[PDB]
């Protein structure tokens, strides 16, 4: 039993809710919240900008030190950093950005990072400003992640479409 509430169950291990991931993180304080990161960990907008804003820019300060030491992430890769006031840990995962021409096949590699964590609160990778089809992203999630994932979908309209079209 865990503290996630109000989710619809899609599969054995995948759950979904219409929620603001920032507010969901603030209430649950999950072990892991996933950020929709880019390779530079520049948290300017989308999920990343909202998560970073909720940390009062502490996420960005920590991220800049990470990049200065380690260099950029790979598309499809991840790193574990602090969850600040939102979670124990933040798993920064880089899905491909269609608006930059990155290969959508890398979306499966991105979701594989979730399998290193038993339970996660996450957004749909490559959705929103990353330009992928969220229905495709949900399918890849279900077919790739084997650990327990709680998906927060900010837009109520998209949430309804994702549920109604789910196979």
Ligand X SMILES: O[C@H]1CC[C@@H](Nc2ncnc3[nH]c4cc(F)ccc4c23)C1
What is the binding site for ligand X (CB under 6 A)? 20-22, 46-47, 50, 123-124, 127-128, 152-155, 158
Decide whether 41 or 124 has the Cβ nearer to ligand X. 124
Residue 136 in 3-state DSSP? Answer: helix
Decide whether 19 or 81 has the Cβ nearer to ligand X. 19
Least separation in angstroms between CB 122 and ligand X: 9
Q: How many helices (H) and strands (E) does the chain have?
A: 6, 7
Least separation in angstroms between CB 68 and ligand X: 26
**Phi, psi at 146, each rounded to 5°:** -110, -15
Decide whether 16 or 73 has the Cβ nearer to ligand X. 16
The arrangement of strands across the sheet holding 8-9 comes to 8-9, 14-18, 148-153, 119-122, 32-36, 89-93, 78-82
Least separation in angstroms between CB 53 and ligand X: 8
Decide whether 35 or 109 has the Cβ nearer to ligand X. 35
CB atoms within 10 A of CB 3: 8
Q: Which residue is nearest to ligand X (CB)?
A: 128
């Amino acid at each position: 039993v865990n503290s996630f509430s109000g989710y619809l169950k899609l599969t054995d291990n995948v759950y979904i809710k219409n929620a603001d991931i920032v507010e969901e993180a603030k209430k649950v304080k999950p072990t892991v919240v996933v950020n929709a990161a880019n390779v530079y960990l520049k948290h300017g907008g989308g999920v990343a900008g909202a998560l970073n804003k909720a940390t009062n820019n502490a996420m960005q300060v920590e991220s800049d030190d990470y990049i200065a030491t380690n260099g950029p992430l790979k598309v499809g890769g991840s790193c574990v950093l602090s969850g600040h006031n939102l979670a124990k840990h933040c798993l920064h995962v880089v899905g491909p950005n269609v608006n930059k021409g990155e290969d959508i096949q890398l979306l499966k590699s991105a979701y594989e990072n979730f399998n290193q964590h038993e339970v996660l609160l996450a957004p749909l990778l490559s959705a929103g400003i990353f330009g992928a089809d969220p229905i495709h992203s949900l399918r890849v999630c279900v077919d790739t992640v084997r650990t327990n994932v709680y998906l927060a979908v900010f837009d109520k309209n998209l949430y309804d479409k994702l549920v109604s079209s789910f196979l």
